[PDB]
Amino acid sequence: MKVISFLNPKGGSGKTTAVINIATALSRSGYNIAVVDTDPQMSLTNWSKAGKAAFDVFTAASEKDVYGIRKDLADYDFAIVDGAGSLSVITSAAVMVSDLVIIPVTPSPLDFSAAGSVVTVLEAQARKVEARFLITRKIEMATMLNVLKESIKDTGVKAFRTAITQRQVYVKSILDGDSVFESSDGAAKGEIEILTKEIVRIFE
Template structure:
């Protein structure tokens, strides 16, 4: 079983949208997927009640719940942790149990600035274990100055960005239901699998 966590304490960075779409893509390939909702607002849990996802959803109310994930969800192929919209001890726990950390960032200085706190947690825990980490650019609009600035800012860190970004599309708000969005998520999921498997 492999664990991936989407972490950025900035709300609106695209964590839950990316979690839903990547998890759905993995499930459509026949994988058994568990998603752990760590956000006190329980956005993903509430979404699941309305939509009935192709994956199982669990909630984690404390860091203890997150530390138990590897043991409690051992029967799954992949576990995806949807990080909270704030920096907390749950963020540290998610870093400790994960095989891959994905930091979603929109082309916004606030998103990238907030991502710095996740990097600080990663650096603080580096003496215990090194965990693969990637930036994921979300809500991308081509040819914008802010996108260029974001890519330059990422290049100044030691963390790579995925080659595939999530483009700003209305279909992501609802679900992946147009061909371009589906293709984008499929390519991104392949990139994730290349790291995990």
């Protein structure tokens, strides 16, 4: 029972949009996924209300839940946790039971200076728990992506080769009540799949 947690307090990063599409992909590979929504506004949970999501959704009300992900969601292969926006007993909650931690970040000057808090929480664990960086909403602004890329290594943690581009299908898809794998955009699906491939590799 491996646990993947997408953490990063700075909102408008990509956690939920990432969690949906990525787990959706993991489901399409035979894995019995179980996404846990912790956001106080159950954003992902609402989106799941529309149509039957490829994965099973669980709404955790308090830290007392994020901690049982091990004993409760034991029947599932993966247990993806959609972090909230506030570093309370939730960010440290995930890291404590998770087996892998993804930090979604945007190519912004200060939208990344909020991830560092997470990287520090991981330290407290080392048993050590795996962790990588996820470049989301990647816009093609050369000069800054480099700024992001650089400041990412100074954290010690590495980031997946692939980065989710800031495409339209990601916003529209969620609006409807489904992922991008429910569209005709091969590009969007592409990266998601190659990224999901990397995620599974991490467990080798």
